[PDB]
Amino acid sequence: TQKSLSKEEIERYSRQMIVPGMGKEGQLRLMNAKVLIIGAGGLGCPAAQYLAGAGVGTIGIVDGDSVEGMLKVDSLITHLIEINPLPVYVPYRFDLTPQNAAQIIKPWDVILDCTDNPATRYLISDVCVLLGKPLVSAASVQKSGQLIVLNCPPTPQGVVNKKAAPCYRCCFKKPPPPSAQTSKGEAGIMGPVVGMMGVAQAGEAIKILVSQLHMPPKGEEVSPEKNLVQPTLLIYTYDLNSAIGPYSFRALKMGGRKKDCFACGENSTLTLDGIKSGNPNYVQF
Amino acid sequence: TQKSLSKEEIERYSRQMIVPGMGKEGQLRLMNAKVLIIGAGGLGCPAAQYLAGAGVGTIGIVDGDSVEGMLKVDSLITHLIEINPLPVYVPYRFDLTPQNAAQIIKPWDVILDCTDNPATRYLISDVCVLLGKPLVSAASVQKSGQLIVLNCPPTPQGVVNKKAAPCYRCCFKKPPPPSAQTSKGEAGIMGPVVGMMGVAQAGEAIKILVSQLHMPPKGEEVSPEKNLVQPTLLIYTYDLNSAIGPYSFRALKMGGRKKDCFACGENSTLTLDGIKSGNPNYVQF
Amino acid sequence: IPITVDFSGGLEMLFDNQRRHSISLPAKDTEGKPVTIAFLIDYICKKLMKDPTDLFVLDNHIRPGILVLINDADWELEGEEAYEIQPNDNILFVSTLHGG
Amino acid sequence: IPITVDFSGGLEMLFDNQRRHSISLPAKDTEGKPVTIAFLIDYICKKLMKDPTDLFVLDNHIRPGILVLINDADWELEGEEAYEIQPNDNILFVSTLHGG
Ligand SMILES: [Zn+2]
Ligand SMILES: [Zn+2]
């Protein structure tokens, strides 16, 4: 709702206010924006740091885990105020589940996924899809990382009749593999990988808000130079036995909603009521 | 010199200790390592953050500038202890010049460049070359950023007879353009760009140390799968009107030492004594 | 047919830290009809592998985990495991990442 | 000769936020001999430009600032401003970044 800029705010944001695309007009977008981050460790931290810094209006965070007593949500928020006092930080000081995940998302304009568990990753997309929200998902384990921008702009469930942004299921159809799953606790993590990926995640979120890419298009089709409906899956491999290689960042363009997707496709048996009840039980492992 | 790992250290580093390439062996490399960052604003912060976190032995920082009273060096170091108490942080609480730059580098194993001024950027390479040190240079203005790994492994000045890593002059031969120069203060900066670039810079530095790539090779040639002697110049353009695009990360392989380079090439009239005196006066503008 | 094969996403670990793989194939399969990508999976897993099978292919089919791309194009629309390989094609095997 | 031309490194700002540029060229220059890259600079700066000249080319030559790459290959070894352009070549104009 805020229409004008504080001398306080004008001073803080002037460095990125004077860039093509980001006027008093472009900045107010971010200040009224409401972004949510699911997961506070690893990808959460840098993602949150670069939203905070950018002056995203409200920044949510969801993690019931503690540090290695004190929840990691709290630790991080305490950190973020130092970067930017002005944003409203909103800690969900527990872990997301089917019972709540519906409740935890309906408020927020853009969803970031840093969840680190495959079951949860599927859950979010489902909900995000149903509620009609854009997902910037991102993953990192060991020496490798990857990122993608799903359901932007958010196309209603089952509307296959129009060129329409792919869901996480549409992409990554049925896998997760049961015994091929490594965790960040299991397999470790190099710092710059999770860092690159988080920072980029924030990058995509900011973009979505500032250029208003979650806004459905004018019977007109959506420009393909946005890479929204046909979005790249950027894969970062970190080779600590080599310098930056031509095959360091590979960009795999992806298909629009799979007409037969379980969730966002034609004849989906997926209901918000469903997930709550335990309907698509996330027993895929 | 340290041969063994504290329970303190073993606890902190276990997450990246269990990754291919990074044993008790690979980690001790970083702990005895001495890295220097020239420039504390913008690219300095994230670069320093991900070295600190990684447990780089000693981390130097050089910036005479204050915040927007209190020097930005001090501000940042204060920040870094929070991330990792164990490293020795070393603030050069002034600005680098020809008179000192020689003095400020001779100690350090790896040099990071975040300097933001073209004259300075050339100065460092010159010195770095002469003293025989590897440079991870990186730059960012407005919506675009780029990074490269020069003089790794460090090949002595004038040794053109062997396949040899390119200097900053060898690359970017005579330009900087006098009136085409925009500063970060002049043209602004989006957050995720400088962030990506800094984090990557740390990335390259860590790699150099952990895999020991500053170490000259066995009469044997240097593997080209390191991309050291023929190193990529990664260019990141941030389009806030689009999602991650295939042309988001473009990787421009670069030429080994230009035999006729002013500085690191055959028949160079460049002397450490020279720069001190004001010899190649950095009046190129 | 000489082609380049790549790995990424914590798969290449299986193939001894190697991502880029160039090996020429026989133009014809075992039963004389042209090489399919059912072939490459079998050839690779049996010969090119440097590790224990469970992680790449199980029950005579690739693990649901991995994506396959032909010239950076979805494998599913272009042939989906029964694809006549081309004289200079690029095939990419990336294990979908579910950690963060 | 139809080729794709690209900008990056805070240059494309000059060409109205556009990076990718496809325009077919005459195979022969003004004096009848084959198109050189002295040509592309002249054609682009005069017609394709959307801004005031100082920033791209001055004194009948590109600003020292910029690098030119032909199929992601150094321009200097391959012809250096007097290069017979090829039927599907890619030429990249990137302004070297000296800020941070
Ligand atoms: Zn779907
Ligand atoms: Zn040189």
Author numbering:
A (entry chain D), B (entry chain D): 4 to 71, 87 to 236, 238 to 304
C (entry chain G), D (entry chain G): 11 to 62, 64 to 111
Article sentences:
In eukaryotes, the ubiquitin‐related modifier 1 (Urm1) pathway is responsible for the synthesis of 2‐thiolated wobble uridine (U34). Uba4 activates the C‐terminus of Urm1 via an ATP‐dependent adenylation step, receives mobilized sulfur from the Nfs1/Tum1‐relay system by its RHD, and subsequently forms thiocarboxylated Urm1 (Urm1‐COSH; Leidel et al, 2009; Noma et al, 2009).
Therefore, we generated a Uba4C202K mutation to convert the labile thioester intermediate into a non‐hydrolysable iso‐peptide bond between the activated C‐terminus of Urm1 and the ε‐amino group of the introduced lysine. The covalently linked Uba4C202K–Urm1 complex formed well‐diffracting crystals resulting in a structure at 3.15 Å resolution, and its atomic model was refined to R/Rfree values of 21.1%/26.2%. The structure revealed two Urm1 molecules with slightly higher B‐factors bound to a dimer of the Uba4 AD, while no specific density could be attributed to the RHD, which although present in our crystals, appears to be mobile at this specific reaction step. Hence, the crossover loop acts as a clamp toward the C‐terminus of Urm1, which appears to remain virtually identically bound to the AD throughout all reaction steps, including adenylation, thioester formation, and possibly thiocarboxylation. Therefore, the Uba4C202K‐Urm1 structure represents a unique previously uncharacterized reaction step, mimicking the thioester formation after the release of AMP that can serve as a model for this reaction intermediate in all other E1‐UBL and SCP systems.
